[PDB]
Amino acid sequence: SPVAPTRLWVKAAFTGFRRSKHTQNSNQALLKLQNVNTKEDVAFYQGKRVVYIYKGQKKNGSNYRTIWGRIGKAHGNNGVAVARFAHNLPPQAIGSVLRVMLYPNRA
Amino acid sequence: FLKQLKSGLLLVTGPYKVNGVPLKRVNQAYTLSTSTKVDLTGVNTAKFEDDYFGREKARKNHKNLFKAELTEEQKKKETERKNARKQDQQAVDTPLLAAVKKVEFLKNYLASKFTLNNNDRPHEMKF
Amino acid sequence: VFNKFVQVGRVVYINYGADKGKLAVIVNIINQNRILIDGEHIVRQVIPIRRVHLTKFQIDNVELNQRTVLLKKKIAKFDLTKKYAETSFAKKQAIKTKRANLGDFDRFRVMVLKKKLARTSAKSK
Amino acid sequence: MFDKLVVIDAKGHLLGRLASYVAKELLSGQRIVVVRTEAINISGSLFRNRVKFSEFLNKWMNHNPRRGVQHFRAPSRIFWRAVRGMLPHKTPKGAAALERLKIFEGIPTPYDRVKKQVVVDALKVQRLRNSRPVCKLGDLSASVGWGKQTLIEKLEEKRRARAKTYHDKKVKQADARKKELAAPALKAIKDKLAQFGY
Amino acid sequence: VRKAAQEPKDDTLQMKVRQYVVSAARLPIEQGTKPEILQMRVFARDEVHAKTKFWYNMRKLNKIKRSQGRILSVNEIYEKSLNTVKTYGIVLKYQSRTAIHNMYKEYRDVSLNGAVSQLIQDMAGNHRAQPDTIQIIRTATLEPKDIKRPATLAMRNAALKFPIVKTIHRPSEKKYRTVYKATRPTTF
RNA sequence: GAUCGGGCAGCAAUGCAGAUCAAAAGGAAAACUUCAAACUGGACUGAGGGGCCUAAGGGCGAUUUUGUCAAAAUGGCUUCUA
RNA sequence: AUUUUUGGUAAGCAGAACUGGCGAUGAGGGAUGAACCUAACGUUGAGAUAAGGCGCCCAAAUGCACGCUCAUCAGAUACCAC
RNA sequence: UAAGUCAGAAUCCAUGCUGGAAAGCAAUGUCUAAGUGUGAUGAUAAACGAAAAAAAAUAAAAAUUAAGUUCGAAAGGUAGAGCGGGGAAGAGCGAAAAAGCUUGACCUUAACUGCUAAUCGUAAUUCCAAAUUAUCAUCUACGUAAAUCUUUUGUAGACGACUU
Ligand SMILES: [Mg+2]
Ligand SMILES: [Mg+2]
Ligand SMILES: [Mg+2]
Ligand SMILES: [Mg+2]
Ligand SMILES: [Mg+2]
Ligand SMILES: [Mg+2]
Ligand SMILES: [Mg+2]
Ligand SMILES: [Mg+2]
Ligand SMILES: [Mg+2]
Ligand SMILES: [Mg+2]
Ligand SMILES: [Mg+2]
């Protein structure tokens, strides 16, 4: 089969951790959500759950693996947002695409 | 969407002929509310409340190492429940198909899946 | 060539402002970077000419430093409203506004309607 | 930044700016290809930039010239050094970043077809007061003896001529399909959509 | 970030000068007396700032110091009508690395506060003046018979037209910002 | 009603239109400062394991529900990577 | 080291005064570096900062407005490199 | 001289010349036993439309201020249908890194119709494509071309290397 039918996740990029020239907090990743541009728009995702998927050797019959987290806060005035994961993201992850999902809908 | 249970879960029917989503407990959180609305003139919900969907679970005990499967009695009970549900559905789905059938594309629109377009902006979207 | 100028009494589009997407008129040129702005839907503003776009509507009736009121009248008599409303610009703009308000079903419809426009053209006769 | 491969047409682009942008894009995962490098612009007298590139030709490793710096005279590489300069290129991460960028002069085969893109902020017209001085890269690489300028021109012309073919066909047929869109059966559906908020 | 009411909605477009009146009196403070009150017009960004400007000038002009007097009041002045363009003259003294200078300057603006703000930016850029150094001697809203500067008189005509020769592309909101787009903009 | 000019007129003498200031009589409103009342979305945290206490309202510093988990699964070790 | 100081043409020289500091001291900023700027250190998470920054290397504005500048030797700032 | 133009150096860059293990590229000779052999497990700084070909000009125009576009987009099934999609051979064209475009046996699929979806129990990657390639195991083929050492030359040589 050609593709997956419906993908409901927004594409995010992993920019790096939250850092100063000589110092970095690896607790807080930075993401840029696709077509997300200003702080206003980023806010919209505030509680949202985000996934990090990667592949590897068979673990419980699945060749993939996951790390789950949430976007918490606007970082700087273009579209950039801190994410926290369960396990602080591995650093090679930096080049890569993460899945923003719309799961957190509340009243 | 049919009605909201006391447990808080949402009561749900993909018309099982059109969607394939037969009759469902769902969480408010896990869904997006569309402004497209179908009237259920056939509202039957009084039939169905939380206790309606139970299930019977195998015994996972410290002497079996939480290694569990269901007995024959259980296969049966669950089969029966399933047939029962199959029945109860048509009750609800039936006025539904009707109501839905009268809205031009609504059958297809229900049959279809919701994907994002690359160019989309879920944060400013109007549904 | 140079047909469209920034002049006392020009019809201008406010872009990049609190006022974006709104027409206005120009009563005075303050320095070379800023003009004085008015209209029915906008307070009397000073704006950097940078934020503004010339609309090719020149109202020769307008007078230097015209009071808000008299301007609004002259503007009304000119039909900035009707005239601009016919413009390819405003037509497109409104079309956008239309696309803005559409629900899941609206899209879906448009898609099936889009497929039909494609697969049906063979109807010669 | 998310499109699978961006291809930039460097023409009328300013070196350093196009540079920084492509650099960032690169760092963040965008795989780029830049084209028509020979067409990039630099602010200053062609003279001044020749003085500068000369000044660079002048630097070298003393005891052994064939170790370290190689002074590259093609526009492609001029740009490349430019970008490598703006990445942490000794870092494994920086390396990846680099590997993402490919650069050419003129518009080579795989890239005839794919849509060429522009970085708006990087345009000479956008960036530089009209009456201030500038150079095209290929002029510099001329002064420094990159021989292919003439060839590239010829080659470009060739490809321009293929363009006119594509386009013209594309226009003719695409008018014919717009005309038959105005016929009765479809005129109906057109109206349906317009009302639908075309 | 405290706005004076007569400043623009966009803080960007103008400096935070406001025009103040400050008035005070010799400290002894004798009751039934008819005190000499010293009053002055200062341009500052604060009440505090204004007080400073006040006292500086006052101790230069007269015997008084602060321990020797009391501040009666500080009252911001406002411009009449923000509907018209006016030509303002300003008379300055400022301090350049060599010496001190008296300048006369003109600006076409909607506010005397605007006249001043523009004056400061100009004086920084063209003259490398330091705000603290600048002393505004007298300020007049100019009658047309009285306007002397060429870049001022330059703008009097109704026939005034600027083509907009070059339009540098500037998206409307940030929501529209793209680094790289699929086609080239235009100027005009 | 009075001034003015970066108007149209008018050959001039003069008029039409402005803009600024503005009498008594009326209308209708914006920006700033201060001080208040109230709505909705997030992130981090849950130290302690009582029946005592009262301003009679409560306080004393997280509870509830549900899902998954037998397989090296989880935690760790050696080596390596960023 | 700031300020004040004597001999000396002068010195990253030789001497003195008050307060610090460096030695005995790490952290962020001055790319870099004992005595500068912020700031004084138990293990750890959040938030908002100082000094300094926000085109890329680099977290953060190719922000929004002003004035001035074209260098066939531009310019790019405390202690600092004349 | 500010735009704009000529002349113009033992200078600069080229031309010529020597290197050229640039972990660059091309053309060509022969060979690669047996199959467009299969199986299992894997890795690739990044698959889920990660969609998209005018050329040129920014003091142009009769006229259009933003890819702020356009196209695609239905069930990760089955049975029919068949708008439409993809393409053997051979014959055409195509060279800047020949990437492919045409025709075409045939292969396939959308509306519409019937079954099939539910008990994957209110979430836990939606594990499937494409281009590459590693390892282990195996079935068929037990062959073909060439090189090197043990020789040879002295146009070369410390030894390797090199000409023959
Ligand atoms: Mg483990
Ligand atoms: Mg002192
Ligand atoms: Mg000493
Ligand atoms: Mg001291
Ligand atoms: Mg001290
Ligand atoms: Mg010691
Ligand atoms: Mg210290
Ligand atoms: Mg912290
Ligand atoms: Mg800028
Ligand atoms: Mg010459
Ligand atoms: Mg020389």
Swiss-Prot record, chain A:
Is the rRNA-binding keyword given for this protein? no
Q: Which SUPFAM superfamilies match?
A: Translation proteins
GO MF annotations in UniProt? structural constituent of ribosome; tRNA binding
GO biological process annotations for this chain's record?
Answer: translation
Keywords, alphabetical: Ribonucleoprotein, Ribosomal protein, RNA-binding, tRNA-binding
InterPro entries tied to this protein: Ribosomal_eL33, Ribosomal_eL33_sf, Transl_B-barrel_sf
Q: Which family does it belong to?
A: Belongs to the eukaryotic ribosomal protein eL33 family.
Protein name per Swiss-Prot or TrEMBL: Large ribosomal subunit protein eL33
What would be the name of the gene that encodes this protein?
Answer: RPL35A
Curated annotation (Swiss-Prot), chain B:
What family name appears in the similarity comment? Belongs to the eukaryotic ribosomal protein eL6 family.
Q: What is this protein called?
A: Large ribosomal subunit protein eL6
Q: Please provide the record's keywords in A-Z order.
A: Ribonucleoprotein, Ribosomal protein
Which terms does the record give in the GO molecular function aspect? Answer: RNA binding; structural constituent of ribosome
Q: Which GO terms describe its biological process?
A: cytoplasmic translation; ribosomal large subunit assembly
Gene Ontology cellular component list:
cytosolic large ribosomal subunit
From Swiss-Prot, chain D:
In terms of superkingdom, the source organism counts as Eukaryota
| Molecular function GO terms recorded | mRNA binding; structural constituent of ribosome
Question: PROSITE patterns in the record, alphabetically?
Answer: RIBOSOMAL_L13
Q: Which UniProt keywords apply?
A: Ribonucleoprotein, Ribosomal protein
A single GO BP term for this record reads: translation
Give the UniProt entry's GO cellular component terms: cytosolic large ribosomal subunit
Q: Which PANTHER family match?
A: LARGE RIBOSOMAL SUBUNIT PROTEIN UL13 (PTHR11545:SF3), RIBOSOMAL PROTEIN L13 (PTHR11545)
The cross-references to HAMAP family, in alphabetical order and at most eight, read:
Ribosomal_uL13
Give the UniProt family note: Belongs to the universal ribosomal protein uL13 family.
Its name, as the record gives it, is Large ribosomal subunit protein uL13
Source organism (scientific name): Tetrahymena thermophila (strain SB210)
Gene giving rise to this polypeptide: RPL13A
Swiss-Prot record, chain E:
InterPro entries, alphabetized: Ribosomal_eL20 (IPR028877), Ribosomal_eL20_dom (IPR023573), Ribosomal_eL20_eukaryotes (IPR021138)
- Which GO molecular function annotations are given, in alphabetical order? structural constituent of ribosome
Originating gene:
RPL18A
Q: What is this protein called?
A: Large ribosomal subunit protein eL20
Q: Where in the cell is it found?
A: Cytoplasm
Per the record, what is one GO cellular component? cytoplasm
Instruction: State the species of origin.
Output: Tetrahymena thermophila
Cite a single GO BP annotation: translation
Which Pfam families does the record cross-reference, listed alphabetically?
A: Ribosomal_L18A
Arranged from A to Z, the UniProt key words for this protein are:
Cytoplasm, Ribonucleoprotein, Ribosomal protein
Q: Does the keyword Cytoplasm apply?
A: yes
Record-stated family: Belongs to the eukaryotic ribosomal protein eL20 family.
Gene3D superfamilies (alphabetical):
3.10.20.10
